[PDB]
Amino acid sequence: DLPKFGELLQNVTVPVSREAVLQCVVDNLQTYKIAWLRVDTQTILTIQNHVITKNHRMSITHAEKRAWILRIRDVKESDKGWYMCQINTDPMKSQVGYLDVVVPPDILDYPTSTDMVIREGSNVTLKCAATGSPTPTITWRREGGELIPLPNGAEAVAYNGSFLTIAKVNRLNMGAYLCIASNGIPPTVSKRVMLIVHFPPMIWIQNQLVGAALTQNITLECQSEAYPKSINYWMKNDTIIVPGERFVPETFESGYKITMRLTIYEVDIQDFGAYRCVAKNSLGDTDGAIKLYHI
Amino acid sequence: YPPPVFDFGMPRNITTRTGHTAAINCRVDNLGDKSVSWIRKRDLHILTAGILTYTSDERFKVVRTADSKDWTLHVKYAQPRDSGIYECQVNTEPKISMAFRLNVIVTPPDAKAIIAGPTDLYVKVGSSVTLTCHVKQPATSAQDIGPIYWYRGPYILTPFVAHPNDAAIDLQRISMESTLAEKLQSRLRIANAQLLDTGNYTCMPTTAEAASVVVNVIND
Ligand SMILES: *[C@@H]1O[C@H](CO[C@@H]2O[C@@H](C)[C@@H](O)[C@@H](O)[C@@H]2O)[C@@H](O[C@@H]2O[C@H](CO)[C@@H](O[C@@H]3O[C@H](CO)[C@@H](O)[C@H](O[C@H]4O[C@H](CO)[C@@H](O)[C@H](O)[C@@H]4O)[C@@H]3O)[C@H](O)[C@H]2NC(C)=O)[C@H](O)[C@H]1NC(C)=O
Ligand SMILES: *[C@@H]1O[C@H](CO[C@@H]2O[C@@H](C)[C@@H](O)[C@@H](O)[C@@H]2O)[C@@H](O[C@@H]2O[C@H](CO)[C@@H](O[C@@H]3O[C@H](CO)[C@@H](O)[C@H](O)[C@@H]3O)[C@H](O)[C@H]2NC(C)=O)[C@H](O)[C@H]1NC(C)=O
Ligand SMILES: *[C@@H]1O[C@H](CO[C@@H]2O[C@@H](C)[C@@H](O)[C@@H](O)[C@@H]2O)[C@@H](O[C@@H]2O[C@H](CO)[C@@H](O)[C@H](O)[C@H]2NC(C)=O)[C@H](O)[C@H]1NC(C)=O
Ligand SMILES: *[C@@H]1O[C@H](CO[C@@H]2O[C@@H](C)[C@@H](O)[C@@H](O)[C@@H]2O)[C@@H](O[C@@H]2O[C@H](CO)[C@@H](O)[C@H](O)[C@H]2NC(C)=O)[C@H](O)[C@H]1NC(C)=O
Ligand SMILES: *[C@@H]1O[C@H](CO[C@@H]2O[C@@H](C)[C@@H](O)[C@@H](O)[C@@H]2O)[C@@H](O[C@@H]2O[C@H](CO)[C@@H](O)[C@H](O)[C@H]2NC(C)=O)[C@H](O)[C@H]1NC(C)=O
Ligand SMILES: *[C@@H]1O[C@H](CO[C@@H]2O[C@@H](C)[C@@H](O)[C@@H](O)[C@@H]2O)[C@@H](O)[C@H](O)[C@H]1NC(C)=O
């Protein structure tokens, strides 16, 4: 007929800065004495109604005869851990329960990756570190939902992991990636990471053969892809072409794409010949020929 | 203000012979209004919180000096199962603590000297006195046999042992004989008792607890 525990030491979950309330139930306590304490540090908390700890945030109440209640006001994440309830029987009895302190997640600036600049076809690793309770799972996405090249040769719209490694980066992989940290404790937070892919230029021409008649206005057009952005100009007889009141070159730039036109006004017999659109950037140059002929 | 601090020079490896009272002394300077707790690290069993005793094992008690500097954990009739680490704990925040190790050894077994006869003798002047002392110990003696000495009060009587002793007693009437006939034994004889022979005779072994007889020499 020694004291017995009326039930388990109930697990308790509580968000940071609130009041934790652990409760220990003892039947037939008689003249015996109940004691609380923190397990990890082996810190005596309370004995009967006295608080042994000088931690002003802890209190003990014994309203109902069978329930001894430990109260931790303004909980910190450092209070998370195992707590014990002890009865000074012989041999002594003890049961333990866990106090889980949940914290909304946060993404650390370090070692989380800053903007990345990678040559096309080379490796890159995006890192991201977050802190929370429970520990947050990290999810990678791209703006617009683009696919992420996965380590296993496949691709998907999301990847779990603190570090995302991409082998052989492609210009299509370029854009804004998102490090999304979540742990069930709102609010979920995220951080944007730019992946920049540099590559030399390439040119496509819809019509490498165009004709016209005198006094006519015709327009030649090329398309290029190059990053960083390329300088695009036109050539003829190996000579640059300047806006000359008759020729007007344009460029329509969008990301790593460029559409370059050369509008010629009032065609003259001297204009016919071999033109060239050219694109050049840090990583190389390229060109493409267009022939303009007479009707 | 000075925060409480431990005297890390106190012995941290207490060794007690089984059956004896073990004592783990813990000294804290600048205690202030903080308390000291004794806890058993093995299972977190709280032993004492301040002067209050929490444990219900009757052999455990804490004692503090008047100035509350020295806190001592006493384990009556210590047994091997009591060996382990005990934590001296001050209720600061965070809490500080020192760890002492209690080692309760069991070898050799309890040995106790015994002097056959009444404890207080009374003999007339000129009579003779013989005191027979023997060591009560378990069967196993083996090579754990040591000399047995005698004392009148604080003065040793065995000759050629305490050198120099300017308080040596004249051994012309006092003889001693130590024989090991199965049981370790020593016999003290006082020939022609004299008033100055009166005193507290002690059988002092080196392998067993001592025993004593009070010898009174009287007139007539
Ligand atoms: C006759 O002489 C013996 C020998 O002791 C002598 O002491 C010196 C003065 C010196 O002459 C030495 O050469 C010589 O050995 C006396 O025997 C001692 O008796 C006392 C009793 O008062 C014992 O003290 C006890 O020791 C225990 C050791 O474990 C200890 O547990 C005891 O503590 C308990 O009791 C005390 C009160 O005494 C109490 O305060 C405690 O809290 C606890 O309850 C106690 O301290 C000595 O150990 C004995 N020493 C020896 C070597 O046997 C003897 O007393 C003396 N007179 C008579 C009449 O016998
Ligand atoms: C009481 O709570 C503890 C702690 O769990 C924490 O708090 C709860 C309130 C919830 O919010 C939990 O999400 C939170 O983690 C529970 O202890 C936990 O039990 C699980 C399952 O037994 C343990 O997982 C094990 O981990 C080991 C180590 O890898 C594996 O080998 C096992 O196979 C298993 O996966 C978990 O480690 C443990 N937590 C701690 C901190 O030790 C406990 O179960 C619960 N008791 C109840 C509800 O009765
Ligand atoms: C990325 O991970 C999340 C988290 O779910 C995990 O599930 C556990 C088994 C463990 O792995 C923990 O780290 C996480 O809690 C996935 O979202 C879960 O999806 C399942 C369905 O498959 C659903 O039942 C769970 O409720 C989801 N979790 C939460 C917290 O809602 C997610 O699917 C993973 N995505 C990728 C691409 O891997
Ligand atoms: C060929 O182009 C000429 C020149 O006009 C061009 O377009 C204008 C919008 C402006 O950018 C000018 O600088 C360019 O040189 C056209 O001639 C014009 O035609 C319009 C309409 O017929 C007329 O109102 C203007 O007065 C004309 N101006 C001149 C200087 O000629 C010509 O019509 C174009 N040919 C064809 C077949 O469309
Ligand atoms: C205190 O003791 C520990 C443990 O050693 C045991 O306990 C002694 C009291 C003794 O009675 C025997 O049971 C043991 O020796 C000592 O730590 C040990 O140190 C030795 C080297 O000196 C090392 O080889 C062991 O691994 C250590 N054991 C552990 C558990 O750490 C410690 O040095 C002793 N301290 C003092 C001041 O004596
Ligand atoms: C680039 O990476 C190559 C391997 O790619 C990665 O290898 C495995 C182990 C995983 O990390 C997975 O994400 C990839 O498939 C290496 O062979 C090569 O040496 C690396 N080169 C450079 C310059 O980084």
Automatic annotation (TrEMBL), chain A:
Residues the record marks as carrying a glycan: 123, 160
Residue ranges of domain Ig-like in the record: 3-97, 105-190, 200-293
Location of this chain's protein in the cell: Cell membrane
Entry superkingdom: Eukaryota
Disulphide bonds in the chain: 24-85, 128-179, 222-277
Record protein name field: Dpr-interacting protein theta
Lineage, top ranks: Eukaryota, Metazoa, Ecdysozoa, Arthropoda, Hexapoda
Residue span relative to the full protein: 128 to 422 of 606
TrEMBL record, chain B:
Gene Ontology CC entries for this record: neuron projection membrane; plasma membrane
GO annotation terms (biological process): sensory perception of chemical stimulus; synapse organization
Ig-like domain span: 1-99, 109-214
Disulfide bond entries: 26-88, 133-203
Record-given protein name: Defective proboscis extension response 2, isoform F
